[PDB]
């Protein structure tokens, strides 16, 4: 019972744009909101993907493979799930595997896909697909993983124990003034709650 | 090795601010990046809080209390963890318990706190504290919780079994068009991954 009335643009850019959104609340009163939008998504259900890489070895408990990388908007380094954009025509699952191999060097298999989930609904229309992927650490191809980053992408890879992911994440945030992604943290919190 | 060199304003607004950021990579080369910021930024620990509300009643499965709200930036409705901005001169924990009682009516006890985590690193600088709050559902004050929403806020409370969260979420996405918050989904995926 709430609908968007109009979207009056405010600014533009090479990657991001900002607009004013007019909408109707339940009662009928018109209200406004400042909405952020990207300029890269086209027909895809989500801007990009986020991979939950589960490293599996026969003599070890599963590791969650993450990536450390300086993020300009934060003016610092963030520990996130491998992530990327979905090219036109590319399936979320494909993009997830491609981006994982690019940012970590690991070839993996799909475990599951998810619906389009929002990154910050109270601010942007940004949605992504969280793809759970498995990686065989015992395989000879994953022996010495050589990352293959794109133009100007500099990524460090950090594998953390699924069993102790939350504690290990708290450790890295204090010593390097680092920042963990909210999704990575919510995932580690559930792992604690369940275990 | 990488740091901010300059942040050029591009646009402003009562709540949102667009910006162009110029920084240096590891090789000593300069690059840019478009970013977003909340003009309502002071000097606290984080922009706001996200509350993971676990409703606990004896002999019952635990329920994860979520909220459904129309989100202008999304042009539709989203299922999210109760959340709100921290007030000036307020602790995360206090913000968490307040924002919970205002958006769902429930009154709980702090379980654990998280360090500020980034909402969307490659687009914004917004951080939140994810606070796990337990709600004793066998107490009178939580028998019939009274939600006190702020002006123009329209929240619908939705409680789902923690033990079946991921599937009960999909049951809603299938029932009607809805977008689940990425943090909520990440959490739900891990509850299943832990075993
Ligand atoms: N807001 C932005 N400003 C400058 N470059 C961007 C922006 N958003 C995405 N990119 C580029 O897109 C790449 C995406 O990498 P990834 O999503 O981790 O596969 C980044 O490494 C940048 O080179
Ligand atoms: N980007 C925005 N555009 C218009 N109003 C906003 C925006 N961000 C926050 N607000 C206002 O701030 C309130 C914050 O609620 P909460 O997240 O519960 O603290 C919203 O209900 C809006 O009334
Ligand atoms: Mg990435
Ligand atoms: Mg990409
Ligand atoms: Mg990449
Ligand atoms: Mg809210
Ligand atoms: Mg509030
Ligand atoms: Mg509120």
Curated annotation (Swiss-Prot), chains A, B:
Give the source's domain of life in one word: Eukaryota
Q: Which reaction does it catalyse?
A: D-ribose 5-phosphate + ATP + H(+) = ADP-D-ribose + diphosphate; ADP-D-ribose + H2O = D-ribose 5-phosphate + AMP + 2 H(+); 8-oxo-dGDP + H2O = 8-oxo-dGMP + phosphate + H(+)
**Residues at which Mg(2+) 1 binds:** 83, 103
Which residues bind Mg(2+) 2 per the record?
Answer: 99
Keywords, A to Z, come to: Acetylation, Hydrolase, Isopeptide bond, Magnesium, Metal-binding, Nucleus, Phosphoprotein, RNA-binding, Transferase, Ubl conjugation
Could you say which residues bind Mg(2+) 3 here? 99, 103, 153
Q: Please tell me where this protein is predominantly located.
A: nucleus
- Note describing how the cofactor binds: Binds 3 Mg(2+) ions per subunit.
| Residue sites binding substrate per the record | 15, 33-34, 38, 71, 85, 120
User: Where's the Nudix hydrolase domain?
Assistant: 44-184
> At what positions is Phosphotyrosine found?
61
Its Gene Ontology cellular component terms are: cytosol; extracellular exosome; nucleus
One family name in Pfam for this protein: NUDIX
Q: Which cofactor does it need?
A: Mg(2+)
- Which modifications occur after translation, per UniProt? Phosphorylation at Thr-32 is required for homodimer stability; dephosphorylation results in destabilization of the homodimer. Dephosphorylation at Thr-32 promotes the ATP-synthesis activity.
Give the sites of the cross-link named Glycyl lysine isopeptide (Lys-Gly) (interchain with G-Cter in SUMO2). 29
Q: Give the consequence of mutating residue 71 to Q.
A: Reduces affinity for substrate about 5-fold and reduces catalytic rate 67-fold
Q: Which GO terms describe its molecular function?
A: 8-oxo-dGDP phosphatase activity; ADP-ribose diphosphatase activity; ADP-sugar diphosphatase activity; identical protein binding; magnesium ion binding; nucleotidyltransferase activity; protein homodimerization activity; snoRNA binding
The induction comment states:
Overexpressed in cancer patients with a poor outcome.
- Family per similarity comment: Belongs to the Nudix hydrolase family.
Subunit structure of this chain's protein: Homodimer. Interacts with PARG.
Q: What protein am I looking at?
A: ADP-sugar pyrophosphatase
* Species of provenance: Homo sapiens (Human)
């Amino acid at each position: 019972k709430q609908y968007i009335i109009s979207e009056e643009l405010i600014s533009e850019g090479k990657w991001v744009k900002l607009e004013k959104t007019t909408y109707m609340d339940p009662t009928g009163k018109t209200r406004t909101w400042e909405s952020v939008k990207r300029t890269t998504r086209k027909e895809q259900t989500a801007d990009g993907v986020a991979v939950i890489p589960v490293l599996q070895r026969t003599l070890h408990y599963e590791c969650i493979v993450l990536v450390k990388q300086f993020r300009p908007p934060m003016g610092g380094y963030c520990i996130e799930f491998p992530a990327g954009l979905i090219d036109d025509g590319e399936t979320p699952e494909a993009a997830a595997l491609r981006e994982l191999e690019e940012e970590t060097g690991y070839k993996g298999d799909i475990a599951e896909c998810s619906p389009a989930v929002c990154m910050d609904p109270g601010l942007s229309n940004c949605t992504i697909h969280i793809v759970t992927v498995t990686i065989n650490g015992d395989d000879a191809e994953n022996a010495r993983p050589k990352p293959k980053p794109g133009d100007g992408e500099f990524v460090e890879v950090i594998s953390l124990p699924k069993n102790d992911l939350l504690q290990r994440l708290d450790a890295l945030v204090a010593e390097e003034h680092l920042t963990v992604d909210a999704r990575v943290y919510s995932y580690a919190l559930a792992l604690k709650h369940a275990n």
